[PDB]
Amino acid sequence: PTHLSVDTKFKTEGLCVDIPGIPKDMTYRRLISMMGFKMNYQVNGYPNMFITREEAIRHVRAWIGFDVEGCHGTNLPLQLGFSTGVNLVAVPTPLMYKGLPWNVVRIKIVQMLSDTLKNLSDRVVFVLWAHGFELTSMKYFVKIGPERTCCLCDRRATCFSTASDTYACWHHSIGFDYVYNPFMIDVQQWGFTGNLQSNHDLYCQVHGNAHVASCDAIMTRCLAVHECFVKRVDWTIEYPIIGDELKINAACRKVQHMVVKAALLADKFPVLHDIGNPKAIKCVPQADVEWKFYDAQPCSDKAYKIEELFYSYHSDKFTDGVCLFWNCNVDRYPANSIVCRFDTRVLSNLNLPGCDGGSLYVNKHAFHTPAFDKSAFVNLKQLPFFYYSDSPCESHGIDYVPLKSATCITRCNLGGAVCRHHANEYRLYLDAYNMMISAGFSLWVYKQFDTYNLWNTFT
């Protein structure tokens, strides 16, 4: 069992206000037929338009919430809303577009999905809170058939053009008018009491209800992210590489080693309390310090309360030495800390919008991360950029312009002229550091941290 059987039952109660008289006994096979689509007994990679909760989770990057509200259904205008904030009015003749016929609305849908999804996913998963009008509108902008490849590349086809009779992926679909082989999931099938707003509002105060289709589309997708990534967490699911994942992760390890090594050299803490990932390894293995670990998985709902991580009776004395919180998100860091905190507000192909101000950071695994809160850092200050090295000044083995920088903390710089080796390493470090920052990571440190204390570690 990998795909959703078309013979699975579909609960129709949520559809009966838009579709009165709808049979209670209903399968996906009959529903797809009712929606105006014919599967023709085809074994060509597309067994069902609808997918399981598990298939949806693996394809979370493709999720686009979708809602259709009857503006006035054959004779009435429809308002199509998407979790991108777009509202389109389709006449059968928070962005709000005036009423237009389906032939032009479909081009806008294809353009919007393609620009939203080309750098995220090989597909689209329409996330529904199905009431009827959204399912019956699909025939006006969706075409289905065998799984196909793009006409200009090797990627799977996501769009079709009636002008050229050709197929394209999200990257080569300019001027295309049909969404081809989309996927969908009805959140109402999961078992809920009450309407969308009542279930959504139980976990989120950031998305309101301005009474438009896009608001419902946003709440639907938010509710789905809550159920799949906030209340339930699965770190066994791998996600494909779509960007700078490897460079970002490598940069994070480089910066962590640099910062902790320098804090230990500058302030000589006798003990380090490493709080976070239960699979953490000493980031400065050659350091003298008593290294003590404390297990905490990444918090996916609210930030950890420091009182619960530290109290209720370990070294016991977290006030001794320094505390290292490398992506261990707490409500208020103690004054003696070294912190890396992901900024959920960051715009990137890895960072998806999440629940209640949180974001869904997807890099190898999916991590729902609680909203970035500037007040968590009141006892600390921003960590300034610096490169420190005690390695020998020796080239070994790319061209050169002499490096002049006050933040290159090396013997050669102290001696008045940065060596080629330390200039190369400084520039590589600066690139890694800028990569980490741009990815959304933020660095904080105890207020007494001063890189002037590193110069005397060269005697």
Residue 45 beta carbon to ligand LJR: minimum distance, rounded to whole angstroms: 33
The item of ligand LJR, Zn ion, none sharing an interface with residue 276, based on CB under 5 to 8 Å by kind, is: ligand LJR
Question: Are residues 361 and 367 in contact, defined by beta-carbon separation less than 8 angstroms?
Answer: yes
CA angle, 331 then 248 then 356, to 5°: 35
CB nearer Zn ion, residue 197 or residue 442: 197
The item of Zn ion, ligand LJR, none sharing an interface with residue 277, based on CB under 5 to 8 Å by kind, is: ligand LJR
Instruction: Confirm whether residue 231 is marked as ligand binding.
Output: no
| Residue 401 sits in the site that holds ligand LJR (CB under 6 A) | no
Number of residues that bind ligand LJR (CB under 6 A): 13
Question: Which of the ranges 87-95, 159-167, 240-248, 401-409 carries the binding residues for ligand LJR, by CB under 6 A?
Answer: 401-409
Instruction: Confirm whether residue 283 is marked as ligand binding.
Output: no
Amino acid 13 reads: E
Instruction: Confirm whether residue 257 is marked as ligand binding.
Output: no
- Check if 307 is active-site: no
Of 18, 134, 227, 356, the active-site residue reads: 134
Tokens representing residue 453 in the block = 């204390």
- Check if 211 is active-site: yes
Rounded to whole angstroms, how far apart are CA atoms 21 and 333? 58
Torsion sign across C-alpha atoms 56, 62, 63, 67: negative
State which of residues 404, 428, 447, 450 lies at the interface with ligand LJR (CB under 6 A): 404
CB nearer ligand LJR, residue 405 or residue 453: 405
State which of residues 65, 132, 276, 370 lies at the interface with ligand LJR (CB under 6 A): 276
Query: Which 330-359 residues touch ligand LJR, going by CB under 6 A?
Result: 342
| Residue 376 sits in the site that holds Zn ion (CB under 5 A) | no
Instruction: Confirm whether residue 422 is marked as ligand binding.
Output: yes
- Check if 134 is active-site: yes
- Check if 67 is active-site: yes
Angle, helices 245-267 vs 420-438, to 10°: value is: 110
Number of residues that bind Zn ion (CB under 5 A): 15
| Residue 225 sits in the site that holds Zn ion (CB under 5 A) | no
Question: Are residues 289 and 315 in contact, defined by beta-carbon separation less than 8 angstroms?
Answer: no
- Check if 425 is active-site: no
Rounded to whole angstroms, how far apart are CA atoms 416 and 436? 30
State which of residues 15, 128, 159, 169 lies at the interface with Zn ion (CB under 5 A): 169
Amino acid 312 reads: S
The residues that touch ligand LJR, with contacts defined as CB under 6 A, are 276-277, 298, 327, 342, 361, 367, 369, 404-406, 413-414
Residues tagged active-site? 67, 69, 134, 211, 216
Q: Cite the annotated binding site by residue number.
A: 67, 69, 134, 150, 153, 169, 172, 200, 204, 207, 211, 216, 222, 274-280, 393, 412, 419, 422
The residues that touch Zn ion, with contacts defined as CB under 5 A, are 150, 152-153, 155, 169, 171-172, 204, 207, 222, 393, 410, 412, 419, 422
